[PDB]
Amino acid sequence: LKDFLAIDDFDTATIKTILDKASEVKALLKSGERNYLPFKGKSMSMIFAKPSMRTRVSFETGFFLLGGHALYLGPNDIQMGKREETRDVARVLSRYNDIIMARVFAHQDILDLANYSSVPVVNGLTDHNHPCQIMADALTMIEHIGQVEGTKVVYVGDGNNMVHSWLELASVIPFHFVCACPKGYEPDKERVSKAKQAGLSKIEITNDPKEAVIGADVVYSDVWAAEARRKAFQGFQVDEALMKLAGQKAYFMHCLPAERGVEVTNGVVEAPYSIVFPQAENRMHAQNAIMLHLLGF
Amino acid sequence: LKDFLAIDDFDTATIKTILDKASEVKALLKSGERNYLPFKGKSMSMIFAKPSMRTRVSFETGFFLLGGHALYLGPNDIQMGKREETRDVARVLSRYNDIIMARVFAHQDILDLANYSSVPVVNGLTDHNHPCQIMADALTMIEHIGQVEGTKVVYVGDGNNMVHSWLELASVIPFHFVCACPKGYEPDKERVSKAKQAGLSKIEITNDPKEAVIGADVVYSDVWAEAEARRKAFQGFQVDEALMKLAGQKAYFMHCLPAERGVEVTNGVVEAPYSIVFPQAENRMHAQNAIMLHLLGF
Amino acid sequence: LKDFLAIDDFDTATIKTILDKASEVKALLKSGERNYLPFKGKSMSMIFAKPSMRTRVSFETGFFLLGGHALYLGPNDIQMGKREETRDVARVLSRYNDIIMARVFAHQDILDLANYSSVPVVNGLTDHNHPCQIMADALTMIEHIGQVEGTKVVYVGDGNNMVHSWLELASVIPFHFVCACPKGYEPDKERVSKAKQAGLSKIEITNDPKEAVIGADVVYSDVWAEARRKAFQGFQVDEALMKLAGQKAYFMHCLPAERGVEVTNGVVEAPYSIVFPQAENRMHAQNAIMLHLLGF
Ligand code: NA
């Protein structure tokens, strides 16, 4: 597989191999090694249609630490799909660089980019999904809980791109995934069915978060968005009361950025069971392993 | 000469030497060599007044591949000519960096930048011209046709910056250059006359594209960019598959990009086997690496 | 001290050591040495809430010349304080990078950034001050005059962030600092008082620029809507003011300069104007600051 567009475009064995490599390279850098430079002489164009801190800094820093140079093409720099068609961007950037990262709106834009690029394309968020975030989240779970297999992950909030990539992961690792979301804001039926097709994981969609969280290893949230949404999502804030219902085993996770007072409270974000900051770090370690894999290392 | 602002600021021999080095260094990189790093310890500030993919990525990637660091100063980062006068930007950046690349509006802003900079200034496109693009074009022609000398290049569209740098090249290499443009949209008379003064090339301005393309080695286009009067005038100047058939069997299609299919050119032409727009785009990096090597004494 | 937020968060000896190292590393680079790379394997996130040429290019280029990679986070990239709270930005970037630079609006934003960052934070300008600029200015003065101690520095203009960082310097090196500012455009009373408490420098706030400049070693300006124009009548640095200052006076301006507003063309381009060497020294002072913060 040339590209990393969705986690279940790979098989179980490949995903676990990449998560093992993630731990190895992370250990190497944590040791202070700065002389492992597999990407010496390689470049990455990073196309960003939207703002970013974690995706941007993790990819640019990681590429640097492994010996390469990443270019930051911001929203107004190349304007993929408006100034210029995606197939043309793909064919140009594939002749300058060795790998392309892209954060876009319509998922089809990243499919187009991958289809027309002769180099690997890595997804850095689309309207549909966010696979590198969940790869990081899996690494974070392995480090804190010990493994992803047989855990209960409960996402509370909008049935959105994060939920889509949780479903991707549930398609290659057997665990229990629940999406507790307001009626009308459920994840894509097709994406839910594709996870069920894999037959590994117990997949539940519910509108009752207070029940869903019971026994969770992970309570996950993200931004909901719109004053209508605020109205629709009353009852879906992750607060200390909800974490108490979830139980003493439960970690709190959030891809960030977080809007305290909306989808989550300050008390939850700052609590000892919150692992949002190690989670954010692990974007760089998971993606380093992903890029290594795509480039034949 | 300190700067690279126009191709015919240099003589024929020097231009040909740059294009030879472009080939050599391209071949080195294609071999997989990453240990020729003459720009180690060197920096380049890249001032961009406008959006860019090709110029941006080619300059920044190539500078990296040769060992240096290029800074991207976007349109809102330093705001040359608005937040700060060009003479002051030139004198500050010349003290930080080893070379400056600039994409601006008024040509005079690039001349000012060069005049007050103690380091070399490279032109990354102005209102007047686009010399690094045509250097890359020349490399592409050498690779596909064999040579630039003795060819017939026919540009179809607005008599604009790309035409100006075609006229620059025609001042230093002898070939046949035809600009087929709507009446009213001719290139600058002084630039046309400057090419003719050099006496190397046959230079024609015409408003009949269907006659102009006959026997071309290259048919070249660019985005056209009262709006209604212009729309009217450019009827007949789209490069379509019919025009390429009139051009003949030895014609390549070139376009500096971005292309707007359905405007200056059709999908079928851009994607045709005779279209060399993607190799052309790559060669921005290789031509510009040779230019920068020259300017910094390599 | 983890961070570089204000010059007088450090003592006199440490500031002098930093300025000494600034000279040494500048000499090394001027020699053509490109093999001193202490920042190999290190990264710096640079958060910019506002446009910049000198701060941006000096930090990005100098971090490169010392072996590291600086990331340019522009105003719309992370939107610190709008898309996401400073304490969260701090905690995330501290896990990716080795050092953070930040140019912000409210000074409290850079204090919050430092308080929640486990890595050093360098100030690249706030509404309150601009310490890296004055460190560069101090280097420039050492190279042109010989030293900062015992000089007379006269700032003419708005009592702003530049004046605040001058008062910071006047708290750790003994010199004579005058701010000639319009009434109601004085620097912060607390910042003046803190410099006087240090007891090293003679510090004067005046409204009479023609008298203040007399005998200066340095006449300093910076960029200063309609009503404000009225109050700054008499505060422009022109050739006549520089004549009053006398033959010892250099002109300095942190830039960008708006000729015809706070300064004339003739002053900016005069032989006594050292604005361009001044700007270069942003890189050399900041290199030494970053070396200090990172334990070199
Ligand atoms: Na590749």
Tab-separated table of C-alpha atoms in Angstrom, chain B:
chain	number	residue	atom	x	y	z
B	1	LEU	CA	26.981	39.728	-12.650
B	2	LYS	CA	25.497	39.680	-9.189
B	3	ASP	CA	21.801	38.913	-9.832
B	4	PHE	CA	19.429	36.832	-12.007
B	5	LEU	CA	16.689	39.344	-12.954
B	6	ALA	CA	16.370	38.749	-16.721
B	7	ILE	CA	17.956	36.098	-18.971
B	8	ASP	CA	19.609	38.556	-21.363
B	9	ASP	CA	21.448	40.297	-18.560
B	10	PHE	CA	23.903	37.443	-19.276
B	11	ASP	CA	25.698	36.519	-22.492
B	12	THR	CA	25.065	33.419	-24.665
B	13	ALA	CA	28.073	31.510	-23.354
B	14	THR	CA	27.093	32.040	-19.687
B	15	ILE	CA	23.451	31.043	-20.264
B	16	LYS	CA	24.604	27.879	-22.095
B	17	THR	CA	27.060	27.068	-19.265
B	18	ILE	CA	24.217	27.358	-16.701
B	19	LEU	CA	22.007	25.042	-18.734
B	20	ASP	CA	24.869	22.458	-18.976
B	21	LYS	CA	25.361	22.544	-15.176
B	22	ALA	CA	21.580	22.187	-14.745
B	23	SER	CA	21.886	18.918	-16.629
B	24	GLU	CA	24.904	17.723	-14.617
B	25	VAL	CA	23.472	18.483	-11.195
B	26	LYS	CA	20.090	17.037	-12.191
B	27	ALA	CA	21.898	13.818	-13.221
B	28	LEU	CA	23.718	13.729	-9.826
B	29	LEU	CA	20.504	14.020	-7.897
B	30	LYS	CA	18.783	11.455	-10.156
B	31	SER	CA	21.596	9.031	-9.384
B	32	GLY	CA	20.495	9.095	-5.745
B	33	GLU	CA	23.575	11.097	-4.580
B	34	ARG	CA	22.734	13.208	-1.533
B	35	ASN	CA	26.273	14.068	-0.489
B	36	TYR	CA	27.018	17.031	-2.768
B	37	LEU	CA	26.101	19.891	-0.464
B	38	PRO	CA	27.762	23.128	-1.672
B	39	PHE	CA	25.117	25.306	0.158
B	40	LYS	CA	26.012	23.873	3.565
B	41	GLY	CA	25.911	26.764	6.049
B	42	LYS	CA	24.069	29.032	3.574
B	43	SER	CA	20.575	30.577	3.810
B	44	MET	CA	18.110	32.083	1.290
B	45	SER	CA	15.189	34.371	2.120
B	46	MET	CA	12.300	33.790	-0.327
B	47	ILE	CA	9.986	36.840	-0.503
B	48	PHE	CA	6.585	35.989	-1.956
B	49	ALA	CA	4.015	38.729	-2.662
B	50	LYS	CA	1.642	36.161	-4.239
B	51	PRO	CA	0.638	32.423	-4.032
B	52	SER	CA	3.038	29.856	-5.574
B	53	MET	CA	3.452	26.122	-5.787
B	54	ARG	CA	6.124	25.561	-8.452
B	55	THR	CA	8.396	28.493	-7.598
B	56	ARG	CA	7.990	27.975	-3.843
B	57	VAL	CA	8.578	24.236	-3.753
B	58	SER	CA	11.282	24.140	-6.401
B	59	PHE	CA	13.385	26.840	-4.697
B	60	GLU	CA	12.876	25.538	-1.180
B	61	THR	CA	13.410	21.857	-2.065
B	62	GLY	CA	16.357	22.509	-4.283
B	63	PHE	CA	18.137	24.683	-1.774
B	64	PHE	CA	17.651	21.914	0.761
B	65	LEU	CA	19.004	19.280	-1.633
B	66	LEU	CA	22.178	21.337	-2.034
B	67	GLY	CA	22.716	21.764	1.745
B	68	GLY	CA	21.174	25.094	2.693
B	69	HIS	CA	18.032	26.494	4.349
B	70	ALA	CA	15.448	28.603	2.494
B	71	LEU	CA	13.068	30.776	4.590
B	72	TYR	CA	9.496	31.273	3.315
B	73	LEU	CA	8.403	34.885	3.761
B	74	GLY	CA	4.778	34.892	2.727
B	75	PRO	CA	2.756	37.885	1.548
B	76	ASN	CA	1.647	38.922	5.056
B	77	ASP	CA	4.981	38.058	6.788
B	78	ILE	CA	7.131	41.152	5.914
B	79	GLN	CA	4.862	43.038	3.445
B	80	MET	CA	7.649	44.536	1.376
B	81	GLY	CA	6.636	47.895	-0.044
B	82	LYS	CA	3.817	48.350	2.539
B	83	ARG	CA	5.023	47.672	6.097
B	84	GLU	CA	8.583	48.461	5.022
B	85	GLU	CA	10.364	49.952	2.009
B	86	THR	CA	12.195	47.591	-0.334
B	87	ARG	CA	15.561	49.360	0.197
B	88	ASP	CA	15.319	48.604	3.904
B	89	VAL	CA	14.283	44.947	3.392
B	90	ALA	CA	17.250	44.528	1.002
B	91	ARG	CA	19.783	45.910	3.497
B	92	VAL	CA	18.485	43.847	6.425
B	93	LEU	CA	18.167	40.496	4.615
B	94	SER	CA	21.597	40.945	2.995
B	95	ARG	CA	23.022	40.901	6.570
B	96	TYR	CA	21.209	37.673	7.598
B	97	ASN	CA	21.253	35.565	4.464
B	98	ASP	CA	23.456	34.653	1.489
B	99	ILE	CA	20.886	35.046	-1.332
B	100	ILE	CA	17.383	36.455	-1.767
B	101	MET	CA	14.657	35.149	-4.104
B	102	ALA	CA	11.698	37.482	-4.772
B	103	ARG	CA	8.248	37.247	-6.395
B	104	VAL	CA	6.715	40.753	-6.635
B	105	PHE	CA	4.243	42.869	-8.600
B	106	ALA	CA	6.047	45.935	-9.969
B	107	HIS	CA	9.269	44.959	-11.710
B	108	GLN	CA	10.803	48.058	-10.197
B	109	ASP	CA	10.455	46.408	-6.773
B	110	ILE	CA	12.818	43.585	-7.830
B	111	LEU	CA	15.273	46.101	-9.348
B	112	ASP	CA	15.199	48.069	-6.118
B	113	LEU	CA	15.797	44.876	-4.083
B	114	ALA	CA	18.858	44.019	-6.216
B	115	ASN	CA	20.229	47.584	-6.125
B	116	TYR	CA	20.259	47.754	-2.326
B	117	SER	CA	21.221	44.079	-1.686
B	118	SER	CA	24.882	43.090	-1.248
B	119	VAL	CA	23.920	39.453	-1.878
B	120	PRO	CA	22.509	38.016	-5.154
B	121	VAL	CA	18.831	38.489	-5.924
B	122	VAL	CA	16.914	35.905	-7.952
B	123	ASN	CA	13.668	36.760	-9.773
B	124	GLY	CA	10.789	34.449	-8.901
B	125	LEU	CA	8.258	36.273	-11.176
B	126	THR	CA	7.344	39.963	-11.554
B	127	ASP	CA	4.688	41.850	-13.541
B	128	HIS	CA	7.320	42.163	-16.295
B	129	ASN	CA	8.964	38.742	-16.640
B	130	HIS	CA	9.677	35.249	-15.344
B	131	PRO	CA	13.243	34.281	-16.246
B	132	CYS	CA	13.664	31.178	-14.112
B	133	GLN	CA	10.575	29.696	-15.804
B	134	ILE	CA	12.041	30.156	-19.276
B	135	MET	CA	15.399	28.793	-18.141
B	136	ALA	CA	13.566	25.643	-17.063
B	137	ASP	CA	11.642	25.655	-20.417
B	138	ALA	CA	14.986	25.815	-22.267
B	139	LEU	CA	16.322	22.829	-20.301
B	140	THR	CA	13.096	20.932	-21.071
B	141	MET	CA	13.466	21.727	-24.819
B	142	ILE	CA	17.105	20.551	-24.785
B	143	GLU	CA	16.009	17.288	-23.247
B	144	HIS	CA	13.042	16.633	-25.576
B	145	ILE	CA	14.039	18.289	-28.863
B	146	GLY	CA	17.830	18.181	-28.421
B	147	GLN	CA	18.581	21.910	-28.490
B	148	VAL	CA	16.895	25.308	-28.381
B	149	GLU	CA	18.861	26.598	-31.402
B	150	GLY	CA	16.931	26.616	-34.676
B	151	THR	CA	13.541	25.685	-33.205
B	152	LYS	CA	10.172	27.375	-33.671
B	153	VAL	CA	8.460	28.397	-30.397
B	154	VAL	CA	4.905	29.747	-30.683
B	155	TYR	CA	3.271	31.284	-27.670
B	156	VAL	CA	-0.527	31.601	-27.933
B	157	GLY	CA	-2.237	33.975	-25.498
B	158	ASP	CA	-1.604	37.300	-23.724
B	159	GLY	CA	1.658	39.197	-24.456
B	160	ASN	CA	2.672	39.102	-20.794
B	161	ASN	CA	5.573	38.243	-18.482
B	162	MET	CA	6.166	34.761	-19.955
B	163	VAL	CA	6.424	36.301	-23.447
B	164	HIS	CA	8.866	38.850	-22.064
B	165	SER	CA	11.221	36.119	-20.848
B	166	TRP	CA	10.823	34.204	-24.125
B	167	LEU	CA	12.083	37.374	-25.794
B	168	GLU	CA	14.937	37.451	-23.318
B	169	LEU	CA	15.982	33.921	-24.309
B	170	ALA	CA	15.627	34.796	-28.021
B	171	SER	CA	18.175	37.616	-27.353
B	172	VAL	CA	20.857	35.034	-26.315
B	173	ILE	CA	20.012	31.874	-28.322
B	174	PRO	CA	19.124	31.938	-32.029
B	175	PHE	CA	15.666	30.539	-32.738
B	176	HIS	CA	12.278	31.501	-34.192
B	177	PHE	CA	9.844	32.906	-31.642
B	178	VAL	CA	6.270	33.796	-32.476
B	179	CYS	CA	3.803	35.481	-30.127
B	180	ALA	CA	0.197	34.925	-31.347
B	181	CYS	CA	-1.787	37.351	-29.201
B	182	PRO	CA	-5.124	39.240	-29.500
B	183	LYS	CA	-4.835	42.710	-30.983
B	184	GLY	CA	-4.355	45.111	-28.089
B	185	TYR	CA	-2.591	42.422	-25.980
B	186	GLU	CA	0.857	42.546	-27.559
B	187	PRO	CA	4.064	42.348	-25.489
B	188	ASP	CA	5.968	45.499	-24.639
B	189	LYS	CA	7.378	47.115	-27.807
B	190	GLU	CA	10.665	47.901	-26.063
B	191	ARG	CA	11.154	44.206	-25.082
B	192	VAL	CA	10.390	43.052	-28.615
B	193	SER	CA	12.818	45.659	-30.002
B	194	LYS	CA	15.533	44.621	-27.483
B	195	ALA	CA	15.278	41.031	-28.739
B	196	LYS	CA	15.544	42.194	-32.349
B	197	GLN	CA	18.621	44.331	-31.562
B	198	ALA	CA	20.501	41.213	-30.460
B	199	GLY	CA	20.073	39.970	-34.064
B	200	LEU	CA	20.044	36.244	-33.233
B	201	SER	CA	16.418	35.288	-33.570
B	202	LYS	CA	13.461	35.645	-35.952
B	203	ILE	CA	10.819	37.387	-33.848
B	204	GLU	CA	7.194	37.735	-34.924
B	205	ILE	CA	4.123	39.247	-33.294
B	206	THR	CA	0.866	38.149	-34.933
B	207	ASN	CA	-2.840	37.902	-34.113
B	208	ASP	CA	-3.446	34.671	-36.094
B	209	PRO	CA	-2.719	31.533	-33.970
B	210	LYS	CA	-3.926	29.048	-36.575
B	211	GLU	CA	-1.269	30.274	-39.031
B	212	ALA	CA	1.377	30.894	-36.323
B	213	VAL	CA	1.515	27.344	-34.960
B	214	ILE	CA	2.330	25.702	-38.278
B	215	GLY	CA	5.549	23.734	-37.957
B	216	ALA	CA	6.081	24.719	-34.282
B	217	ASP	CA	8.410	22.647	-32.094
B	218	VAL	CA	6.621	24.191	-29.056
B	219	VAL	CA	3.156	25.602	-28.635
B	220	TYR	CA	3.152	27.470	-25.321
B	221	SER	CA	0.329	28.807	-23.168
B	222	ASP	CA	-0.265	30.553	-19.803
B	223	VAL	CA	-3.321	31.685	-17.808
B	224	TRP	CA	-4.813	34.926	-19.207
B	225	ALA	CA	-5.866	36.340	-15.819
B	226	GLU	CA	-13.097	45.721	-18.884
B	227	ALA	CA	-13.343	41.964	-18.318
B	228	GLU	CA	-15.949	41.568	-21.061
B	229	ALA	CA	-13.820	43.199	-23.761
B	230	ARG	CA	-10.901	40.917	-22.897
B	231	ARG	CA	-13.180	37.865	-22.993
B	232	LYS	CA	-14.215	38.916	-26.522
B	233	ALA	CA	-10.657	39.541	-27.701
B	234	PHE	CA	-9.319	36.129	-26.531
B	235	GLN	CA	-11.912	34.182	-28.516
B	236	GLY	CA	-9.734	32.131	-30.947
B	237	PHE	CA	-6.691	31.866	-28.624
B	238	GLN	CA	-7.584	28.729	-26.642
B	239	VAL	CA	-5.041	25.933	-27.304
B	240	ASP	CA	-7.248	22.967	-28.283
B	241	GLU	CA	-6.570	19.625	-29.926
B	242	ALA	CA	-7.464	21.127	-33.325
B	243	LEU	CA	-4.778	23.815	-32.951
B	244	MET	CA	-2.175	21.216	-31.957
B	245	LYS	CA	-3.070	19.196	-35.086
B	246	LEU	CA	-2.438	22.334	-37.218
B	247	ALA	CA	0.847	22.833	-35.377
B	248	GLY	CA	1.942	19.451	-36.640
B	249	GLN	CA	3.483	16.179	-35.531
B	250	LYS	CA	6.786	17.568	-34.058
B	251	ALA	CA	5.008	20.033	-31.758
B	252	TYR	CA	5.203	19.670	-27.968
B	253	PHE	CA	2.733	21.494	-25.729
B	254	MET	CA	4.132	23.492	-22.831
B	255	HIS	CA	2.431	25.594	-20.151
B	256	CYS	CA	4.092	27.189	-17.105
B	257	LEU	CA	1.025	26.223	-14.948
B	258	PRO	CA	-1.328	26.473	-13.107
B	259	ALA	CA	-3.574	25.629	-16.033
B	260	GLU	CA	-7.264	26.501	-16.257
B	261	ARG	CA	-8.805	23.885	-18.449
B	262	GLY	CA	-11.626	25.254	-20.544
B	263	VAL	CA	-10.037	28.714	-20.628
B	264	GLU	CA	-6.585	29.085	-22.246
B	265	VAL	CA	-6.258	25.340	-22.911
B	266	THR	CA	-8.356	22.126	-23.057
B	267	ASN	CA	-8.084	19.030	-20.877
B	268	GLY	CA	-7.255	16.980	-23.983
B	269	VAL	CA	-4.201	19.094	-24.794
B	270	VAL	CA	-2.851	19.189	-21.197
B	271	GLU	CA	-3.137	15.404	-20.919
B	272	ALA	CA	-2.010	14.591	-24.494
B	273	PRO	CA	1.126	12.504	-25.186
B	274	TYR	CA	2.809	15.608	-26.721
B	275	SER	CA	2.192	17.594	-23.494
B	276	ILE	CA	5.353	17.965	-21.412
B	277	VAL	CA	3.948	20.223	-18.680
B	278	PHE	CA	4.921	17.943	-15.732
B	279	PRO	CA	8.584	17.408	-16.821
B	280	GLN	CA	8.660	21.138	-17.542
B	281	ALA	CA	7.532	21.865	-13.925
B	282	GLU	CA	10.152	19.585	-12.438
B	283	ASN	CA	12.855	21.391	-14.358
B	284	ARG	CA	12.128	24.601	-12.413
B	285	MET	CA	14.165	23.023	-9.617
B	286	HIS	CA	17.042	21.810	-11.788
B	287	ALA	CA	17.433	25.048	-13.769
B	288	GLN	CA	17.182	27.197	-10.614
B	289	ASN	CA	19.756	25.018	-8.784
B	290	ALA	CA	22.270	25.775	-11.568
B	291	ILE	CA	21.339	29.474	-11.495
B	292	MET	CA	21.885	29.691	-7.742
B	293	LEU	CA	25.180	27.748	-8.006
B	294	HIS	CA	26.357	30.268	-10.606
B	295	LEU	CA	25.352	33.323	-8.582
B	296	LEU	CA	27.153	31.990	-5.479
B	297	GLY	CA	30.368	31.246	-7.343
B	298	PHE	CA	30.097	27.491	-8.096
